[PDB]
Amino acid sequence: DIVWVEESVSAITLYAVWLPPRAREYFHALVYFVCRNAAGEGRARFAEVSVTATELRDFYGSADVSVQAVVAAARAATTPAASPLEPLENPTLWRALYACVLAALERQTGPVALFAPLRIGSDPRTGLVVKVERASWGPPAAPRAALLVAEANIDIDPMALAARVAEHPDARLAWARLAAIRDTPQCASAASLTVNITTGTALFAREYQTLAFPPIKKEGAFGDLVEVCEVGLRPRGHPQRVTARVLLPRDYDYFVSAGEKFSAPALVALFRQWHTTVHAAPGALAPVFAFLGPEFEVRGGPVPYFAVLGFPGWPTFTVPATAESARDLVRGAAAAYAALLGAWPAVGARVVLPPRAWPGVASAAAGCLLPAVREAVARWHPATKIIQLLDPPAAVGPVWTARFCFPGLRAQLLAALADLGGSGLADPHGRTGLARLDALVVAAPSEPWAGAVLERLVPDTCNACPALRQLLGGVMAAVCLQIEETASSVKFAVCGGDGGAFWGVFNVDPQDADAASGVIEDARRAIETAVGAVLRANAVRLRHPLCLALEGVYTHAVAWSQAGVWFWNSRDNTDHLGGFPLRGPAYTTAAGVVRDTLRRVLGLTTACVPEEDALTARGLMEDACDRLILDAFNKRLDAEYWSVRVSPFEASDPLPPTAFRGGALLDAEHYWRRVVRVCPGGGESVGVPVDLYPRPLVLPPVDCAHHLREILREIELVFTGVLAGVWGEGGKFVYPFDDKMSFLFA
């Protein structure tokens, strides 16, 4: 006799993480379900889980973490006024915590799925969800949203940022700010924070000079869009009746924040104020104040996100810029939330499998393969490329060339190998995380939102399990071997590539095009079929049937380095350049100059002795360099144009002591540091972090005698490669920048 309802779960958040009595190595966690029934009406629900120590150490990847540490972190996060920003101590701890609580939720209660129909039960005697089951009836309500804008001037003292950056050098400045709030929470009490959440029913706007103080401007009402719910619960951990206050999000479902100037400290401060305001009255339990994002780690992260691990229980999606297709990225964020249960991108690679169950699956996948690939996996050394390719100083043409790619080969191969090791998993029900990856791979061609997930879930998974790299690159090595074997039969000739993407030539007469399409299509058919056959023979089965993409037909192709290739189809003048670093806005203009110079220099096929062509080519390359440096002068004062994106891994210029004064601008720095080298006074070249100063900027003249030298070094690799690849070798194209056209800037 269990109650039964019909609802869709819109979010799953963490309320309490406690250690029951007579307990040493298992902690209970209460989960808040934001359920909404048909037509949008929302009733709040709760469930309980029980995570053991072993599961925690599995999702952490190490035994350093303990149940006592997790419970202490949760207790610290119980109060945001005393100490917010709890995850910043051990971000991996909270990452693993959310991973295991979601896994236990899936295991004990049953299958859960956001924004999807779900039959839900409850036990009144205790008062929590007991079992969740996938339903098959109902046109579920649309996942409504609310647009949030929040800006705060948290008066952080610059010297503290400088000191904390001195302790850890390559600390992304958002982490420096966030650590400053963490070490002095009173700073989050005084800030000119402004908030404007617009919904479809009623708007809400507030303005503060000091956060704790009453608003200096009120628009709409808090109750208009927010419903406070007091729910009684009797967990197995708590025998006494425990009451919980939750902020049921009426009217909306999730938040949509612009990622252009998103400040994680701003939302942290606003949510801390809301937490204090709602849980000020006692007689009820307090929730977990936990948030994760790329700003929460020293070295930062690629993809902007803002996790909501606890209070208020509403997912908030940062959609960076992309104004033209704002709806597209909002839908992509919503789909990423719904599919991977909202763990992505906060939990990390643990959405699929625990970081420590992978060492078993990889071993269990090295056994079900064929005997040859079994060794091929074991002999994989970084960048082996055991396949007949071209010497990197070389070029081809005029012959019919073609580029091919298998869309999402690493992700599809990882999915097949995960299934091969699936039998080796401890729990058959613990393979639901192995159902999200297949959902991603299946929906990858249909929708690009799965794409960006798979281009980051896979490389990060390969870092979670180092042993998976030698497996994936062995399977791909086997794929390349059969590509080469089948190539000879269809006149295709492997000339270069990087595995899933490969470009080659055809031994057809280089003048006929009517039959060219036929051979170019038969080669695709045969290579695709043969690779699929090898994969099937290797037992690895792909969910989405394999497909080869004809990414372009070209007549000339020139390669200089291992990644640098330029292709050009003379008939339609369609070209493609790869391997040129786009490390700024000037490198794009350099790439365009290179792709025009190469188009003009391979148009010199007029009958001539090879020696003549080398000189009439070098002259044109020098002229192209001249026209580039001439146009460089007309943009000498655009410092943002002469900017380079330094990674937190690369060696970086030292931060000026005045860049620590950007206010609500230091938060934007999550991954890249955009630096411009200016030349104050004389002789000395100093770096300016462009995005840490207010605009319009005032600077000494930009040292174009440094950036143009680097751009010219890249253009020179491309041109030494083409000069020594089409005609006779022996010529390193050098442009005398220091003499011919140095005067313009220095």
**SS3 annotation, 350-409:** HHCCCCCCHHHHHHHHCCCCCHHHHHHHHCCCCCCCCCCCCCCCEEECCCCEEEEECCCH
Q: How far is CA 488 from the centre of its chain?
A: 39
Helix (H) or strand (E) holding 15: strand 3-18
**Residue 397 to residues 353, 402, 449, 566, 569, Cα–Cα distance (Å):** 48, 12, 38, 12, 10
Which single residue is written with the structure tokens 């030349």? 679
Helices vs. strands in the chain: H and E counts, helices first: 19, 24
Question: End-to-end alpha-carbon separation of the chain, Å?
Answer: 85
**Residue 610 to residues 527, 604, 616, Cα–Cα distance (Å):** 37, 11, 10
Question: Tokens standing for 111?
Answer: 């299958």
Q: Look at phi and psi of residue 385 and say left if phi exceeds 0, alpha if psi is from -120 to 50, else beta.
A: left
13-39 b/e (C-beta count within 10 Å ≥ 16 → b)? bbbbbbbeeeeeebbbbbbbbbbbbee
Cα distance between residue 14 and residue 485, in whole Å = 54
Cα distance between residue 79 and residue 75, in whole Å = 8
579-610 b/e (C-beta count within 10 Å ≥ 16 → b)? bbeebbebbebbbebbbebbeebbeeeeeeee
**Residue 336 to residues 7, 312, 330, 451, 671, Cα–Cα distance (Å):** 20, 20, 10, 10, 21
Cα distance between residue 439 and residue 544, in whole Å = 10
Rg (CA), the chain: 29
Side-by-side strand order, sheet with 217-219: 217-219, 204-207, 194-198, 145-151, 254-258, 316-319
Looking at residue 653, the DSSP 8-state letter turns out to be P
Do the bridges between strand 254-258 and strand 145-151 make them parallel or antiparallel, or are there none, so unpaired? parallel
Closest CA relative to residue 362, chosen from 511, 269, 515, 475: 475
Do the bridges between strand 316-319 and strand 254-258 make them parallel or antiparallel, or are there none, so unpaired? parallel
Q: How far is CA 146 from the centre of its chain?
A: 24
- How was this structure obtained? cryo-EM
Question: Tokens standing for 365?
Answer: 């996948």
Cα distance between residue 494 and residue 385, in whole Å = 12
Q: Letter for the amino acid at 127?
A: G
Q: Please, are residues 60 and 350 in contact by the beta-carbon 8 Å criterion?
A: no
Measured in angstroms, the resolution is 2.8
